[PDB]
Design an enzyme around this catalytic site. Structure first.
Site: not given
Ligand SMILES: [Zn+2]
Ligand SMILES: [Zn+2]
Ligand SMILES: [Zn+2]
Ligand SMILES: [Zn+2]
Lengths: 50, 51, 117, 64, 1130, 137, 50
Positions: E758-760
């Site tokens: 999730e966007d990490s």
RNA sequence: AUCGAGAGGA
């Protein structure tokens, strides 16, 4: 484009993929569509929250 | 009704200048014109000046 | 039927309004400003084309053939002059918004013939 | 455009009332204080400012 | 002779290079300011009327000539010295130059006793100066000379320094003037309304707007004109009558050019009938005079009023002189004519969003608006000051009359605050102009200097002005726009976009009367039928018989750099017979290659001369002078047939156009500064390009070369900036290669341990140990000791526990005798860097020391001491804090792929290739598919090729010589899988991963958003004075807002005690004493235990009530409004 | 809802002193057919003629005959506004409403306007458009 | 898809195209083009999927 | 410290 050009290219049909890459006119028309999405996202919030 | 000081606190400032609140300034305006009007209605004052 | 134009007085140059002469029972065109009168040659005072059957060819002007942005075609020669090339374009006006009809104009200079297929 | 006017005769502010009798094409301006009255022709485009205008003009013309 | 396709791709870029060698990126700012100083100030001073004052003797006080010297600074002694921009930045001075005006004051009393006294160079004010402008001390300096003044040679300029703060004027959109625009409002009493914001070209006055409307649906259309300074509408025929055209034929001659048209005629007729009552000019002038001056005015004066409005106030651009009413009548009739065409549908309603219809209000014209207002106010004060002396009969000294603070302080205030207008009208003024220049990174500075702004209002929820209009092509970046509440309202210039500076039309007009043109007062209206109208800056000046060869002549004059300058737009509408010529300012235009029959005018001789641009001084501007390039504005693009590339000119099996007139220099110039950074932007979803254009401005780098001398409040510098391995040919002009804002990172797109979901991202701890994406954060603290009066004075000095009263328990040992910490001293949170003590009226001095912003823990980088404008001590302390990337720091590629660091693994924990290459960053594959950022993947593959080949990759957007296949074939030549995949091994176990991972170099950015600047916690900290609730902000040690929606959520949860805790116990618990009888808060004395209500005169029925302090405050503010909220406890 | 404008091709006002000798040549048949029989006196009739040309196909689309239109006109305005009309056979669907008992040339325009806009030949007012279809869902 | 859209564009240009019920001729042409191009996009998507 | 403004983040 010539005047009165209702063909697919002229009116914003992107006949390329993202891997192929968009032509400059396709790029601008795609930016227009994406801007519509961004405006919708940024304008619906106030009115839904109310 | 004048409210108390807590409704309109006089906040102190980086130095000593005590800044008053908007309500305090407005009560200053009301008071000055009230006193001034009072002395006019008590004395002889033009009806349009009193108005 | 055809439309009716405004006509002006010849004394004050103001528009002539209709009126009726009962003692000849004839139409007249009289000025409210002065007291000039005319006898009509029309007999028709008002015309409304609800259908708006306008010939848009009359609205086109030959100079549009000079437009570099208009498309040109060699497939529709001119019936006036025989010039081989011609510009074409759509109606693009109110009450011509329906019907994508193409209008053609000859690109020969000083011919400027206009037509429709 | 104000409808009540200062009277040129008695200088009473907003003491002049204007009546537009359109059926007769006449405007009547009357001062309530000094009871001065003036009548002028009016058109459908006329307004109380135009009637008061005609009154001021009539006064200045008559005072020559 | 002809440039062949094989050479084109560098011919074009050679041309582009020459453009940016001549113009730069902030050319619009500098040209606007230059025009303002060379013209606009002198025009404004001369356009002011001479102030004739007399009791008798009389004085006129002409102003005749201006002189703007260089920026100088006067000390307390007053010796003028040249002030350099860096000194202004450091000392919090305003980089301004003095404006002097020559004044001529002639005494005229009687008997021809005339004598003139001229005061040469009367100091009228101080003008702030845009940096690198013509009047800047940095003008014409070499890179040597700039460095030798502590200036960055790469600094574009284009901004002002007001009180040491760098301020940039944002271009303001506005709807063009002197042009008739017909719109139709769906919900209104008019079917159609035409307007013209007429404005005389020389800025004598503000624009005056005339409206010619169409009454809503005898019941036929009625046409009225809303003239300025006239209380009520006017029927148009009475306006025409007031211009002396009494006969109804004469009026229609101006309105209708062809009487054969029945349909126009019948439409106009209701207006003729509506004005039939007034038949002669004096009654018409009467009728208009009645509305306006006063209810009671003499007839002669009423007429004079109506005349004055008509020749001055109505349509000033047509003319303001006497005996112009033929011109006025023709232009007014043209407005009515336009209204009729729109009403009949022959002509389209004008489009508000067409930039052909819009103008950009740049630094020059905006400063002109200010200068007009301020010079007016100054002259008013001169009049008043002189008037009192003349009333007393004594002579008056003009120097004393001129209080120069009005121009100086007005310009300084408006540029400092951004409130564009008079300081008194601080609410009617429009803010957002003149923002603080973004100095985060070089791209942010450039973009902020090329920023445009559409003042529609962010509150407006109509999407139409926010949509990307077709006409923005080549003028405005399609991508760069804020994604928040201003989307599409704040815009950015495209790279080759140039906003016209304005020009005089007199050469063009003079030429037109040579040529076949005829004046408008000189024609009969019958000629207007098949003739072509000629407008110049909106102004119908005449008619012409052969518009085609007129346009050929005018174009070929402008292409020769003859009387017509390059920025002049010349549009021929053919279907409607107008030729509209524009010379005014604010027209956004762009350069394009002219095309012959089917052939570029740009031959190989031009490219050859451009190649040796540094020897033979053959520049862009010679390319323009050769008639090979042309600036085309938005409105003239409507008449242009563009070739995207010279390949479009090539004779094809089926010819598309075959009549092109211009060609793009390169399509990639449709992008702006920040979008020109994106590699392969035409392989991304457009929102991703927008998000990157936003995030490139938060990327760290080296924002400017001379950062060592700048005392910026906040500054981030990356330790090891790298130029991207995969670059676009536009970055050569953005100077990104010279001040880059990222690092090439070995990116693997993989699912590894789940810490990048999730966007990490997962970063390499070892790479971070080696300096990967390490930055330094500089924070500057101001302070000044004020000796404002003998009552109380501040002073820098090491405080002492015995004399200072408000001394915190923090130790002051790090300070020196002078009260200032020294450089190289390590300072932790809550430490003191400046010891300032203020004399009292813990005796005779109180501590007012400056502490560090809490929880920073840096080292004092340097300490500067100087004197401010008024001249007390002034100190600036820069503290330095090394920011090593950590979990929670935000990173981004150039494709909208942002994410925080989820975890850091050491090199032995990361996955490795057969040759022991570990990724610097691992991003999750789930960030690609929905986002469709294929440019990220193509950049990774191209970067692998570039690193293995020793290149820099070419990721210019529309390049058919670069696609994925040819990159893959290149990569397969270096012993790699052609698609950029590699076998990786698990770092923890050493086993091969079953899926071959996609890995390669990608340019990543470290963004300003570090977690250590965001983390915040509170447990019983300080509270607000008015309502005893937790403060707001990290900086204030404030509490987090438990808002209405959290209340709603906890109500849905049913958690009543938690809700009471959050909204009563943890915010503002309080007690009041309430009279049980009247329910009003009573008087309690808990020390003596006496409790009484003065209202009820009881002291036994009083109750304790536990309520929030905000509620007690509300009830008291309700009594302030005579409301009785009575808390009945029964 | 169908107003007279939706089915009208073009309206015009003439000055026809005689109904027997009409201004237009193609309407001379049915007019003299109407007038010899004195159902409606010639003297009562006014000089000012209202001629409206209906287009055929719009009449057919609402399955509307001039009979229904003339009935609606004579109902909305009573006998004050005489209307006459030919059969549904001529190449041009025409009907003539000259007034029969601000000048009449102006009056007849106010009448014409009011007829075209707010005279309801068929349907229910404030139901503008209707689409018939088969629901697939 | 493009060459079908060209087919439709000539029919409209030569007045060979008649409206469908409930739409003007412009809107029918637009429908007919958009449904050619959506068929194209769906078919090409299917090809890519398979 | 208060007020306002602006720029940003999700
Ligand atoms: Zn006359
Ligand atoms: Zn021909
Ligand atoms: Zn009176
Ligand atoms: Zn009580």
């Amino acid at each position: 484009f010539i005047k009165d050009d209702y063909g697919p290219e002229s009116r914003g049909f992107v006949e390329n993929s993202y891997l192929a890459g968009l032509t400059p006119t396709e790029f601008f028309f795609h930016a227009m569509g994406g801007r519509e999405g961004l405006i919708d996202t940024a304008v619906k919030t106030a009115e839904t929250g109310y | 009704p004048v409210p108390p000081l807590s409704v309109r606190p006089a906040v102190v400032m980086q130095g000593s200048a005590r800044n008053q609140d908007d309500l305090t300034h407005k009560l200053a305006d009301i008071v000055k014109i009230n006193n001034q009007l009072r002395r006019n209605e008590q004395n002889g004052a033009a009806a349009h000046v009193i108005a | 039927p055809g439309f009716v134009g405004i006509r002006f007085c010849q004394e004050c140059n103001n528009m002539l309004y209709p009126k009726e002469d009962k003692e000849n029972r004839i139409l007249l065109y009289a000025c409210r400003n002065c007291d000039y009168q005319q006898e009509a040659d029309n007999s028709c005072i008002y015309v409304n084309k609800i259908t708006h059957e306008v010939d848009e060819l009359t609205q086109i002007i030959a100079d549009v053939s000079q437009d570099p942005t208009l498309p040109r075609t060699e497939d529709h020669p001119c019936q006036k002059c025989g010039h081989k090339e011609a510009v074409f374009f759509q109606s693009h006006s109110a009450r011509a918004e329906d019907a994508m009809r193409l209008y053609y104009v000859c690109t020969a200079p000083h011919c400027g013939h206009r037509w429709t297929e | 455009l104000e409808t009540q006017f200062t009277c040129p005769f008695c200088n009473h502010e907003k003491s002049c009332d204007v009546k537009m009798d359109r059926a007769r094409n006449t405007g009547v301006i009357s001062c309530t204080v000094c009871l001065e009255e003036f009548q002028t022709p009016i058109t459908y485009l006329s307004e109380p400012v135009d009637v008061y205008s005609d009154w001021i003009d009539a006064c200045e013309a008559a005072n020559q | 002779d002809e440039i062949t396709p094989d050479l084109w791709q560098e011919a074009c870029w050679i041309v582009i290079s020459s453009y940016f060698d001549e113009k730069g990126l902030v050319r619009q700012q500098l040209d606007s300011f230059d025009e303002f100083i060379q013209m606009s100030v002198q025009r404004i001073v001369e356009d002011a009327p001479p102030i004739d004052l007399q009791a008798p003797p009389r004085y006129l006080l002409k102003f005749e000539q201006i002189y703007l010297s260089k920026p100088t600074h006067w000390e307390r002694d007053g010796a003028p010295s040249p002030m350099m921009p860096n000194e202004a930045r450091l000392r919090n001075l305003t980089y301004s130059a003095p404006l002097y005006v020559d004044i001529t004051k002639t005494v005229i009393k009687e008997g021809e006793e005339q004598l003139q006294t001229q005061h040469q160079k009367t100091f009228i004010g101080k003008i702030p100066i845009m940096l690198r402008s013509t009047y800047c001390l940095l003008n014409g300096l070499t890179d040597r000379d700039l460095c030798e003044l502590n200036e960055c040679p790469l600094d574009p300029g284009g901004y002002f320094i007001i009180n040491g703060s760098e301020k940039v004027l944002i271009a303001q959109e506005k709807m063009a003037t002197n042009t008739v625009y017909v719109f139709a409002k769906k919900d209104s009493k008019y079917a159609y309304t035409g307007e013209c914001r007429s404005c005389l070209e020389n800025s004598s006055r503000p624009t005056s707007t005339i409206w010619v409307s169409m009454l809503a649906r005898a019941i036929g259309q009625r046409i009225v004109a809303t003239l300025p300074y006239i209380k009520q509408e006017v029927p148009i025929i009475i306006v025409f009558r007031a211009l002396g055209f009494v006969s109804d034929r004469d009026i229609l001659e101006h309105i209708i050019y062809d009487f054969e048209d029945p349909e126009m005629m019948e439409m106009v007729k209701p207006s003729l009938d509506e004005a039939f009552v007034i038949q002669e000019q004096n009654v018409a002038l009467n009728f208009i005079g009645s509305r306006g001056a006063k209810p009671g005015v003499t007839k002669e004066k009423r007429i004079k009023y109506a005349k004055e409005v008509l020749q001055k106030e109505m349509l000033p651009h047509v003319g303001v002189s006497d005996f112009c009413e033929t011109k006025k009548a023709y232009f007014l009739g043209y407005m009515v004519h336009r209204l009729l065409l729109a009403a009949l549908g022959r002509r389209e309603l004008d489009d508000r969003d067409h930039y052909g219809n819009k103008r950009l209000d740049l630094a020059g014209p905006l400063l002109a608006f200010l200068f007009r207002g301020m010079f007016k106010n100054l002259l008013k004060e001169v009049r008043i000051y002189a008037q009192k002396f003349i009333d007393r009969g004594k002579d008056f000294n003009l120097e004393l009359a001129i209080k120069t603070r009005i121009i100086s302080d007005g310009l300084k205030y408006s540029l400092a605050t951004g409130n564009w207008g008079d300081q008194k009208k601080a609410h009617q003024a429009r803010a957002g102009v003149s923002q603080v220049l973004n100095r985060l990174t070089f791209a942010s500075t450039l973009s902020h200097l090329r920023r445009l702004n559409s003042p529609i209002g962010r509150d407006g929820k109509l999407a139409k002005p926010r949509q990307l209009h077709n006409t923005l092509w080549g003028m405005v970046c399609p991508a760069e726009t804020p994604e928040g509440h201003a989307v599409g309202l704040v815009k950015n210039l495209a790279l080759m976009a140039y906003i016209s500076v304005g020009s005089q039309p007199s050469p063009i007009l003079e030429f037109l009367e040579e040529w076949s043109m005829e004046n408008l007062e000189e024609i009969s209206p019958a000629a207007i039928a098949d003739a072509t109208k000629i407008f110049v800056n909106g102004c119908w000046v005449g008619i012409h018989k052969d518009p085609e060869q007129l346009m050929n002549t005018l174009r070929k004059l402008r292409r020769q750099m003859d009387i017509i300058v390059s920025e002049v737009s010349m549009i021929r509408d053919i279907r409607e017979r107008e030729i509209r010529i524009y010379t005014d300012a604010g027209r956004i235009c762009r350069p394009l290659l002219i095309v012959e029959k089917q052939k570029l005018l740009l031959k190989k001789r031009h490219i050859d001369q451009l190649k040796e641009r540094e020897y033979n001084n053959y520049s862009w501007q010679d390319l323009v002078a050769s008639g090979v390039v042309e600036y085309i504005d938005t409105l003239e693009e409507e008449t242009v047939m563009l070739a995207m590339t010279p390949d479009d000119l090539q004779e094809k099996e089926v010819a598309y156009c075959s009549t092109y007139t211009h060609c793009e220099i390169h399509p990639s110039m449709i992008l702006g500064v920040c979008a020109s950074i994106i590699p392969f932007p035409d392989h991304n979803q457009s929102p991703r390009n927008t998000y990157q254009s936003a995030m490139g401005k938060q990327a760290m780098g080296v924002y400017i070369t001379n950062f060592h001398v700048r005392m910026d409040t906040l500054a981030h510098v990356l330790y090891y900036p790298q130029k991207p391995l995969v670059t676009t040919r536009s970055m050569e002009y953005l100077r990104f290669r010279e001040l880059p804002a990222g690092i090439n990172s070995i990116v693997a797109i993989a699912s590894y341990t789940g810490y990048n979901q999730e966007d990490s991202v997962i970063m390499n701890r070892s790479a971070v140990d080696r300096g990967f994406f390490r930055s330094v954060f500089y924070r500057s603290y101001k302070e000044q000791e004020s000796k404002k009066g003998f009552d109380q004075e501040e002073v820098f000095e090491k405080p002492t526990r015995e004399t200072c009263q408000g001394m915190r328990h923090a130790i002051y040992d790090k300070l020196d005798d002078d009260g200032l910490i020294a450089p190289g001293v390590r300072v932790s949170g809550d430490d003191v860097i400046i010891g300032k003590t203020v004399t009292l009226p813990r005796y005779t001095k109180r501590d007012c020391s400056t502490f560090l912003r809490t929880s920073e823990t840096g080292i004092v980088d340097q300490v500067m001491v100087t004197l401010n404008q008024e001249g007390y001590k002034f100190c600036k302390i820069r503290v330095r804090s090394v920011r090593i990337p950590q979990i929670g720091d935000k990173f981004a590629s150039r494709h909208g792929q942002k994410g925080t660091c989820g975890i850091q693994y050491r090199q032995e924990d990361m996955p490795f290739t057969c040759e022991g290459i570990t990724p610097d960053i691992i991003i999750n594959p789930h960030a690609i598919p929905s986002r469709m950022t294929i440019g990220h993947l193509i950049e990774c593959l191209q970067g692998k090729v570039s690193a293995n080949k020793g290149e820099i990759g070419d990721a210019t957007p529309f390049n058919d010589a670069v696609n994925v296949q040819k990159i893959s074939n290149l990569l397969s030549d270096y012993g790699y899988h052609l698609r950029g995949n590699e076998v990786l091994y698990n770092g923890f176990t050493g086993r091969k991963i079953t899926s071959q991972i996609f890995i390669g170099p990608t340019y990543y950015q470290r963004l300003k958003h570090m977690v250590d600047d965001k983390i915040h916690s509170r447990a019983r900290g300080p509270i607000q004075i008015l309502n005893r609730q937790p403060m707001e902000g990290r900086s204030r040690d404030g509490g987090l807002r438990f808002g209405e929606m959290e209340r709603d959520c906890q109500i849905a949860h049913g958690a009543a005690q938690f809700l009471r805790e959050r909204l009563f116990e943890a915010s503002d618990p309080y007690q009041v004493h309430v009279c049980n009888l009247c329910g009003i808060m009573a008087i309690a004395n808990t020390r003596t235990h006496t409790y009484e209500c003065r209202g009820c005169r009881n002291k036994t029925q009083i109750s304790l009530v536990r309520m929030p302090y905000a509620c007690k405050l509300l009830f008291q503010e309700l009594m302030s409004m005579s409301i009785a909220p009575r808390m009945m406890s029964v | 809802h169908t107003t007279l404008r939706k089915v009208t091709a073009n309206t015009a006002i003439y000055y026809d002193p005689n109904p027997q000798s009409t201004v237009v040549a193609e309407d001379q048949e049915w007019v003299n057919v109407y007038y010899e029989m004195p159902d409606f006196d010639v003297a009562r009739i006014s000089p000012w003629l209202l001629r409206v040309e209906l287009d055929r196909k719009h009449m057919t689309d609402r399955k509307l005959t001039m009979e229904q239109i003339a009935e609606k006109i004579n109902a909305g305005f009573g006998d004050d506004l005489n209307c006459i009309f030919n059969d549904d056979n001529a190449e041009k669907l025409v009907l003539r409403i000259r007034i029969m008992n601000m000048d009449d040339d102006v009056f007849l325009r106010c009448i014409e306007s009011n007829m075209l806009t707010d005279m309801t030949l068929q349907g229910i007012e404030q139901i503008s458009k209707v689409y018939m279809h088969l629901p697939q869902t | 898809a493009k060459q079908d859209v060209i087919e439709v564009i000539e029919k409209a240009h030569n007045n060979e195209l008649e409206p469908t019920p409930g739409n003007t001729l412009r809107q029918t042409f637009e429908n007919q083009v958009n449904r050619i191009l959506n068929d194209a996009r769906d078919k090409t998507g299917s090809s890519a999927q398979k």
